[PDB]
Structure 1
Amino acid sequence: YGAIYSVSGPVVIAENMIGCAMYELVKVGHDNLVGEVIRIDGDKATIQVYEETAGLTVGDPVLRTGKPLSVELGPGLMETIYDGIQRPLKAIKEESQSIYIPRGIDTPALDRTIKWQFTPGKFQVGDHISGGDIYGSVFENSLISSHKILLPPRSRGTITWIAPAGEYTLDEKILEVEFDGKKSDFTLYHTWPVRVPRPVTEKLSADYPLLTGQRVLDALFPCVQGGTTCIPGAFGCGKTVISQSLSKYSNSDAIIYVGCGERGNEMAEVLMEFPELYTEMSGTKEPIMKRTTLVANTSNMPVAAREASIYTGITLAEYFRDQGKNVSMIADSSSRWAEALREISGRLGEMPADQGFPAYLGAKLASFYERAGKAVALGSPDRTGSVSIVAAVSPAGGDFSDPVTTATLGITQVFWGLDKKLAQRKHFPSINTSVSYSKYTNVLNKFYDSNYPEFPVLRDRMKEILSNAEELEQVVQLVGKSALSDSDKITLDVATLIKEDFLQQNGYSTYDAFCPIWKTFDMMRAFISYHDEAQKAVANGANWSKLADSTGDVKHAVSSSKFFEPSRGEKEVHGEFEKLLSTMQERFAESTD
């Protein structure tokens, strides 16, 4: 198409633009380097090269790819590791035997050797089709199929060619659409741009909770599925432990991991730790790696994968939410994407902004958090889906007043802090009562209380004991150890056992990863009834050590109740709490006398 006019630095200038848009990606020269036209000034177009420009001279042709810079969505995304630019990591590990993509890569974004069985849907010949309807289904998992074959956006017409059932590849076509003549060819996989979100029928308010398995996380401030959550990272404070524990202990059908500016060790530890550990949903043949999607880009790769990693993860999470499954988007971190966008903005020659970041970082960060959420499926088939955006926010430039952490903290309505002492203390997450907050706890308590919750009464009482013990610790330190009363020792003793039983979790057994809502609901009622019975027993005349020694195995069994199996009452309710309430009521009379 165009001719190379000049090459200065990492950016390339090409003239002879006769229709090349500023959103389409193409390869400059004969090396097939990754690049995209960022701007255009007259006949000469400005394209940013994210790869090595060695061996490029003036007078070379520029071949366009024929579409915008996006990623391919189809079968085979699970159980594979790729970059943000849709680069095959398993193909580079098979051919080159390395984890870094070389310069001049032009392979496809999906594997073509793994064939899948395509089954036809309820659509027949003669009926009109449209984007959003389920045209078929293809297996993508190791045991079952979860990738629903739907119509892509910007397409409609009649089904002129109906492919039958059988095994086919991604390159071979199985469907054809007829609209105004020869519109285009359809296959198993489809292309979609990463700069445009997936359209749906309508958006709804998120009221469903994320099945993770944290007793203190679900009990104190339960983050619902489909809300924006921000967490401050420290690069070693517990950010990778929450993603690794949330990926393995989580029982969701879909999972998307987005690595924008990681060092490389966390992507290899999370990638190698996935097939070794099993899941809680009874999966087999790599259930952790098959139900999760790996998108890991290091800090030494090009900025196109780091900047397009959030758009590829948001597009794959939008396609997974449009397919009807719930996917959790865990990203780390936004500071590497903001620094990668600021490096391309400063290298391209654009005007700078406050704090050295670009002016579009606030609109891209607001559009990235606003793109996720719970919504219905597009087209006529309405399905239930949710997209939880949990992105970490590390420091950039050695400051705390930048608009990245302040804009992400002010834009989000849920917060989960992480401390360096809490990660060393075996606490996950490292926030007890002052490091986390949530505004959607009213709807989450209305839905979880809508199923069969008793957490709505003990929700404020659970945080009230920790706030009373934390407020009493400063009065005990500054005022004196003998200034506290007997009720403060029972409240701090109940908050220590509730924080040690609920917040104290490091995956010691198989019951500390997956936690039901019934055990967390009865666990707060057992500690609330033990604190109320301890305060009422101490109010009638008794000692603190005489009351704790009078309790004994009743209070000691509540701390060791997490070690027991979760199938105590039917399959999820703890039966030790129901008899422990009457046992604590019978022990309350012996504790007073």
Structure 2
Amino acid sequence: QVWPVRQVRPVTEKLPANHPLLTGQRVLDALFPCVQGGTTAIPGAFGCGKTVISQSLSKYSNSDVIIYVGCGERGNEMSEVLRDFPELTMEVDGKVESIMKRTALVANTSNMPVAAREASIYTGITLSEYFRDMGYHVSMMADSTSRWAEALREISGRLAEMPADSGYPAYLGARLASFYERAGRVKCLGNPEREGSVSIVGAVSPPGGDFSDPVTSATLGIVQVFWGLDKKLAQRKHFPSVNWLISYSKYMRALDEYYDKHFTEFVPLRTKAKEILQEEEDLAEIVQLVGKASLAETDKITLEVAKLIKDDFLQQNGYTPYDRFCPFYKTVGMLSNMISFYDMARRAVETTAQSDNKITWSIIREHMGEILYKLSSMKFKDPVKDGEAKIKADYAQLLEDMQNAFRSLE
């Protein structure tokens, strides 16, 4: 069948989105979750991971099919996808199978004609709406929606239309809107009922690395998820470089009804993680002008657990086999341990600072230095080599070891 790409493929109804799009990455799945049917942007300066995330969703996610749109991206991106995806494998029904069998590529690399960028976006979403009508939970990557907006800028410039900002046409907001609104979970057309979806992931690439950029500003007013990548994290090779201060997801209220079923322990842990990270920033602005000696011992514990969360939870190496993917059971187990340390260590100080027998962060570090090292070591557990019961048992052992060590300080 032939479909006009600019016209949305109809549906019986656009359902609310209510199931997580589990990805390769801890910070995404845990702290800023996408939903199957959700609209997402990854605004980031050059060399931050915007394509590593785009690839990692495509390699490792619960999506039935991926449409990968190399719109204006570098040439070796498509080569890296075609290198990896035939060799990389999912499993179905006890059979190993190549993930290329569930992916389609719409290449339009940066040197290919500027106009074809617009057609490439509309092609990839039309393919995604086609498999959505089959009931497949589609995921669509767009490797730069600003390299699309630049093609609208160029044609608009050749037509000599009046620009809005940075030369972009005034209709850029509507062009982006009528792209992201093609996402959703849907009651498909026609007789047999289906619950297909398109989830869209636009890797916005702001000129100069600055989120005041019109494509970023227009995109942020349209998406419901924002994984802002900070170049300062990427320079430090802190990857994924998702800035946890600026990033957000609007889907959390819709996903809480899933976590309350499948992961009833998780919503408190998500909340405490965001709070510990926010407190570390609100502490750091003081420390930077006076030194660490100014802090209370609870606040040393807050800073140290925020360093554990930064270096071992939020950070994840997408190439090394231990962190190449990170299932949600590994993710919650890691976070549960880091927050279990926080609540026990904080209780240990608050219980004893009332007395001469006062516990301090240094007392905890000297009695429990091996526990801090073990907490950081949790990322090295490998779901290929280690069974679920083994990782769960090891993480339960760290909970017990921490409890008995803190009980030995009190």
Closer/same/farther in 2, CA of residues 509 and 401 from structure 1, 3 Å limit: closer
Conservation of the 8 A alpha-carbon contact between 1:518 and 1:572: no
1:456 pairs with one of 267, 271, 277: 267
Counterpart CA distance in 1 for 2:87 and 2:117 is 27
1:311 pairs with one of 106, 109, 122: 122
Conservation of the 8 A alpha-carbon contact between 2:230 and 2:243: no
1:549 aligned residue: 366
**1:53-91 deviations in Å (ceiling 9; x for gaps):** xxxxxxxxxxxxxxxxxxxxxxxxxxxxxxxxxxxxxxx
1:142-291 to 2 correspondences below 5 Å: 190-279=1-90, 284=96, 287-291=98-102
Closer/same/farther in 2, CA of residues 402 and 252 from structure 1, 3 Å limit: closer
> Shift of residue 461 of structure 1?
0.6
Counterpart CA distance in 2 for 1:236 and 1:381 is 45
Counterpart CA distance in 1 for 2:49 and 2:318 is 14
Closer/same/farther in 2, CA of residues 401 and 478 from structure 1, 3 Å limit: closer
Conservation of the 8 A alpha-carbon contact between 2:187 and 2:195: yes
2:221 aligned residue: 410
1:372 aligned residue: 183
1:577-588 to 2 correspondences below 5 Å: 577-588=395-406
Q: 559-568 or 311-320: which moved more?
A: 559-568
Conservation of the 8 A alpha-carbon contact between 2:227 and 2:243: no
Counterpart CA distance in 1 for 2:392 and 2:133 is 36
1:446 aligned residue: 257
> Shift of residue 577 of structure 1?
2.4
Conservation of the 8 A alpha-carbon contact between 1:512 and 1:562: yes
Conservation of the 8 A alpha-carbon contact between 1:251 and 1:279: no
Counterpart CA distance in 2 for 1:210 and 1:490 is 33
Conservation of the 8 A alpha-carbon contact between 1:453 and 1:521: no
Matched, 1:298 2:128: no
Counterpart CA distance in 2 for 1:268 and 1:423 is 23
> RMSD across aligned C-alpha pairs, in angstroms?
2.5
1:17 aligned residue: none
SS at match of 2:42: strand
* Structure with more contact order per residue of length (Cα contacts < 8 Å, sep ≥ 6): 2
Question: What is the one-letter code of the residue matched to 2:81?
Answer: V
SS at match of 2:14: coil
1:497 aligned residue: 308
2:348 pairs with one of 531, 534, 537: 537
Counterpart CA distance in 2 for 1:586 and 1:379 is 60
**1:300-351 deviations in Å (ceiling 9; x for gaps):** 222442111111111111111111211211102122212212322333x363
Counterpart CA distance in 2 for 1:442 and 1:398 is 31
Closer/same/farther in 2, CA of residues 206 and 425 from structure 1, 3 Å limit: same
Conservation of the 8 A alpha-carbon contact between 2:228 and 2:243: no
Counterpart CA distance in 2 for 1:557 and 1:445 is 30
2:164 pairs with one of 354, 357, 365: 354
**1:117-169 deviations in Å (ceiling 9; x for gaps):** xxxxxxxxxxxxxxxxxxxxxxxxxxxxxxxxxxxxxxxxxxxxxxxxxxxxx
Conservation of the 8 A alpha-carbon contact between 1:418 and 1:435: no
Question: What is the one-letter code of the residue matched to 1:474?
Answer: E
1:10-25 to 2 correspondences below 5 Å: none
Question: What is the one-letter code of the residue matched to 1:343?
Answer: E
2:200 pairs with one of 372, 389, 396: 389
> Shift of residue 396 of structure 1?
5.0
Q: Normalization by structure 1: what TM-score?
A: 0.63
Closer/same/farther in 2, CA of residues 490 and 304 from structure 1, 3 Å limit: same
Question: What is the one-letter code of the residue matched to 1:563?
Answer: F
Matched, 1:485 2:277: no
> Shift of residue 572 of structure 1?
9.1
**1:347-386 deviations in Å (ceiling 9; x for gaps):** 3x36333233334322221110111111122112222222
> Shift of residue 564 of structure 1?
2.0
Counterpart CA distance in 2 for 1:251 and 1:243 is 14
> Shift of residue 204 of structure 1?
0.6
SS at match of 1:274: helix
The share of aligned pairs that are identical, in percent, is: 66
Matched residues, number? 401
**1:270-319 deviations in Å (ceiling 9; x for gaps):** 3323334444767745x132221111102222244211111111111111
Question: What is the one-letter code of the residue matched to 2:183?
Answer: A
1:591 aligned residue: 409
Any gaps of 5 or more consecutive residues in structure 2? Answer: 353-357
Question: What is the one-letter code of the residue matched to 1:575?
Answer: A
Closer/same/farther in 2, CA of residues 405 and 293 from structure 1, 3 Å limit: same
Closer/same/farther in 2, CA of residues 335 and 447 from structure 1, 3 Å limit: same
Counterpart CA distance in 2 for 1:207 and 1:283 is 29
> Shift of residue 516 of structure 1?
2.5
Whichever of the two has the greater Rg, that structure is: 1
Conservation of the 8 A alpha-carbon contact between 2:22 and 2:328: no
Counterpart CA distance in 2 for 1:243 and 1:383 is 26
> Shift of residue 395 of structure 1?
3.0
SS at match of 1:531: helix
2:333 pairs with one of 522, 529, 538: 522
1:168 aligned residue: none
Question: What is the one-letter code of the residue matched to 2:381?
Answer: F
> Shift of residue 571 of structure 1?
5.7
SS at match of 2:226: strand
> Shift of residue 242 of structure 1?
1.3
Question: What is the one-letter code of the residue matched to 1:352?
Answer: M
Counterpart CA distance in 2 for 1:265 and 1:578 is 43
Matched, 1:333 2:168: no
Structure with the higher strand share, 1 or 2: 1
Q: 469-478 or 271-280: which moved more?
A: 271-280
1:425 pairs with one of 213, 236, 249: 236
SS at match of 2:130: helix
2:323 pairs with one of 512, 522, 540: 512
Conservation of the 8 A alpha-carbon contact between 1:241 and 1:428: no
SS at match of 1:482: helix
**1:211-249 deviations in Å (ceiling 9; x for gaps):** 213222222121222111122232322222212222223
Counterpart CA distance in 2 for 1:527 and 1:440 is 25
